[PDB]
Amino acid sequence: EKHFKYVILGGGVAAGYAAREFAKQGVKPGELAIISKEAVAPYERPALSKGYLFPQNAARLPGFHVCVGSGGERLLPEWYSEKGIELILSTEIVKADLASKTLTSAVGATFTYEILIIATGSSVIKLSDFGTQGADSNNILYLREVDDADKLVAAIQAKKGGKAVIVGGGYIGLELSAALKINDFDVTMVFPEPWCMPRLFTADIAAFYESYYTNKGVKIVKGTVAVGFDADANGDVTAVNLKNGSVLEADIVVVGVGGRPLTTLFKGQVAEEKGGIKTDAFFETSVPGVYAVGDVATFPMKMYNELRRVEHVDHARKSAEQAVKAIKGKESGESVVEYDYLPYFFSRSFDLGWQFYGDNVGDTILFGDSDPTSAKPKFGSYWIKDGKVLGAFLEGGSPDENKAIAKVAKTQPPVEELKKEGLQFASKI
Ligand SMILES: Cc1cc2nc3c(=O)[nH]c(=O)nc-3n(C[C@H](O)[C@H](O)[C@H](O)COP(=O)(O)OP(=O)(O)OC[C@H]3O[C@@H](n4cnc5c(N)ncnc54)[C@H](O)[C@@H]3O)c2cc1C
Ligand SMILES: NC(=O)c1ccc[n+]([C@@H]2O[C@H](COP(=O)([O-])OP(=O)(O)OC[C@H]3O[C@@H](n4cnc5c(N)ncnc54)[C@H](O)[C@@H]3O)[C@@H](O)[C@H]2O)c1
Ligand SMILES: O=C1O[C@H]([C@H](O)CO)C(O)=C1O
Fold this sequence. Notes:
- By secondary structure, the chain is of the alpha/beta class.
- The protein has 3 domains: 1-125 and 258-343, FAD/NAD(P)-binding domain, CATH 3.50.50.60; 126-257, FAD/NAD(P)-binding domain (3-Layer(bba) Sandwich); 344-429, FAD/NAD-linked reductase, C-terminal dimerisation domain (Enolase-like, domain 1, 2-Layer Sandwich), CATH 3.30.390.30.
- It has 9 helices and 26 strands.
- The protein has helices spanning 13-24, 77-82, 127-130, 146-158, 171-182, 203-215, 313-331, 399-411, 422-427; strands at residues 2-3, 6-9, 32-35, 86-88, 93-97, 102-105, 110-112, 115-118, 140-141, 163-167, 186-191, 219-222, 226-231, 237-242, 247-249, 252-255, 272-273, 276-278, 290-292, 297-301, 306-309, 344-349, 352-358, 363-369, 378-385, 388-395.
- The strands form 6 sheets. A 5-stranded parallel beta sheet has the order 4-3-2-8-19.
- The longest helix is centred in the C-terminal third of the chain and has 19 residues, at 313-331.
- Bound molecules: flavin-adenine dinucleotide (FAD), nicotinamide-adenine-dinucleotide and isoascorbic acid.
- It catalyses: 2 monodehydro-L-ascorbate radical + NADH + H(+) = 2 L-ascorbate + NAD(+).
């Protein structure tokens, strides 16, 4: 049975960033462990949908260990041992007893803590979860962890020049459709909503990305879902059957239909809200000494006076740091500031890249141009509620422009004629 003062459960983004902050905060050898089911030390998960998939000069471990994704120092396994931070890899925790402060691995082993950080991230939703016919076929692929990414790269090699079907029109769909096309596949994206990224993109924004993709030769089939798959005698996928009776031939299927917080270890033991583990502004759960960070946390979003859960990397990094600051604060007597999060989302594909800051509520307007025949296109939007700008999006911004939209979102300036020189508005705030 192992004993640690601090245990981080999960070896992902939030775990690595927590490890960095513990080290900044003076953690001593033998005090901290990170327990992860993965076989590798924490890494910047966003690379798996982007650089990992380049057909040459691809990202690979140990390159994109944390914290290189935010311009930080890289934490190789050897950083952890030299600091006496125990990485316990290839270890899945299958039970957590918060009353006894003990965790039990799949293999029977046991681990105790005085302070626990839950950083278990999200599951990948799978068509097999739905019981979809033929969803067990080979080369139907998901992307959450580096092991999944390796399987996809291997399929991309095995099936080169063939046909790929991307199921889903969220972040994964967007990024992976682009990656497959760059890898020389005939690519078709299939999704049920009226335009891609329906939660964040407006119809205007979505139409830009759809036309851009179309121009790159990506086929887009809207208004339907996969209801079945054909497989060959070896059980490899050969076609995707759609709700509307169409069939798409496929050598590879990539599915991105959402993720859900991995919180079932704690079912009944902590308070839960909006699908995640409820926390305060310090990431502390119902149970004292038990924190929850990253994708699992439902936490108070100061600037919008609501609880929220966020499933993006910037929050994973920041929430991790905050927890460690709160823990360390309590040891010498806090105060620590409440988490004050400004939402930051972003995606890049092909030669495109956008950022969004704030909250996408209220009425929207589009500025700039907007032309999918490029180059490089530069256009944005503002979300306006109660006479204030609450949210801002920009595709193709320089660093000063991106900064300027972030400042709009953080300061919520009043407005009416923005559309006029939209970007200039941000540049003058
Ligand atoms: C492929 C991909 C690309 C993405 N790209 C972007 C992007 O470009 N921008 C952006 O904003 N967001 C992106 N995201 C979202 C972002 O990566 C997440 O918000 C972030 O990883 C959350 O970090 P976290 O540590 O909560 O969880 P995760 O990094 O998932 O870490 C969870 C860790 O806990 C381990 N775990 C879970 N249960 C157990 C257990 N029982 N025992 C031991 N270990 C366990 C997992 O294996 C993992 O190591 C991306 C996500 C994916 C999947
Ligand atoms: N740049 C980024 O921020 C980025 C990039 C990659 C992954 N991710 C994260 O990774 C996780 C997984 O992403 P995702 O794209 O899978 O989730 P997502 O929630 O961003 O979107 C999933 C999409 O799946 C579709 N959907 C739901 N059921 C479906 C079905 N039966 N058939 C077809 N489509 C269906 C909807 O169009 C929805 O838009 C999320 O937490 C996401 O935030 C983030
Ligand atoms: O935040 C990120 O982490 C990775 C970095 O580029 C990894 O260095 C990535 O691709 C991002 O968008």
